[model samples]
Target: MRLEDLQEELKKDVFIDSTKLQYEAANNVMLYSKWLNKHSSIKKEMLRIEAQKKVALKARLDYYSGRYAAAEMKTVLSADKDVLKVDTSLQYWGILLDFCSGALDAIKSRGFAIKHIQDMRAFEA
Candidate 1:
């Protein structure tokens, strides 16, 4: 089945993985996406592909090290569904990473630290 299909199945699954697993996976996804964001070409590529909110989600990866809601992370990662449907596994990840990186420009444009509003509260506190 296609990656999007699988993701849809997972989304409907009654038994989701433990919060620990989701947290770990989210961190890894964000980390890899951030790596992709480091390059200008990749960043540009993402902007050409994904939606603005999706880009904002990726930009939030800057301070996404260990804190983010599971649902939100899942939603952002799920947005990659179209990426998988469009390319081979290799190309899919490459494109997704680049797309994921596209958000960093937004992150830097505002010159901010962290992504989620809660983190902002903590940072300010």
Candidate 2:
């Protein structure tokens, strides 16, 4: 399905993951996003793409992680849904990671570390 379709299914206030897994994923999403943030970009478009990816990841975490409780009901989707092979969250995340890796590899072959570009900015600062 398209990301929009998947997101739409997610956005209906339907099945979201458990709080713990959600928190972990959200933290990792932010962590990686920030890691990328530490670097610089030679082109405005590349930076914009990177920012979009980071926002997607963060939204994944936010959309997936989080819990709701009532006096008698606790709504949660167990980590097992994805972690125990019950669903495709792990697979999706892995693929996204691979996607990023391939992109980073492309960048590296051109003779640069991500942080290196950011460092140039820092030097000027």
Candidate 3:
């Protein structure tokens, strides 16, 4: 099958595997499948895309390297901005912490626009 045709086929398969309402929600599956296919394409070229992004970022940094260095040398204020330390004290507190921690991890999913969650887990310092 062609690239676009492969997406359609994969989309159909994925959509059908979705929940009943989602699969049969009057072309909702089509939307989901399209998104999935786009995600698939991105995944396939992730390494190349990452390399390109890194090169672009390096070019931008090189352009402002001196300015950024100078700016870093000048400190505006001394404020403590650090990542929150996880609390695993009491059992109940641990449970509550796990709940909120999992939620925050999932919420901070910067790039994962995937419909099905896989990397949803607690992160440690």
lDDT of each: 0.45, 0.40, 0.38
After TM-score superposition, the amount by which residue 27's alpha carbon in candidate 2 deviates from its true location, in angstroms, is 26
User: Ranking by TM-score, best first?
Assistant: 3, 2, 1
Q: Across residues 9-118, which tens digit of lDDT does each residue of candidate 3 receive?
A: 54443333224433344454344444455445544454454455455545544444543355652231111111011111122333433433433343233123333332
Residue-level lDDT of model 1, residues 69-96, one tens digit each, is 7677665554545433432344554654
Residue by residue across 2-41, what tens digits does model 2's lDDT show?
3454345323322223434445344434544532432222
RMSD of 3: 18.2
Give the clashing residue pairs of candidate 1, or none: 37-101
Candidate 3 is scored at a TM of: 0.26
Off by over 4 Å in 2: 1-86, 112-125
Q: Which runs in model 1 stand beyond 4 Å of their true positions? A: 1-87, 112-125
Clashes of each: 1, 2, 0
Candidate 2 lDDT for residue 84: 31
* Candidate ranking (lDDT, best to worst): 1, 2, 3
Measured with C-alpha atoms, the lDDT of residue 118 in candidate 2 is 47
Q: How far is candidate 2 from the true structure (C-alpha RMSD, Å)?
A: 20.4
lDDT of 1 at 26: 54
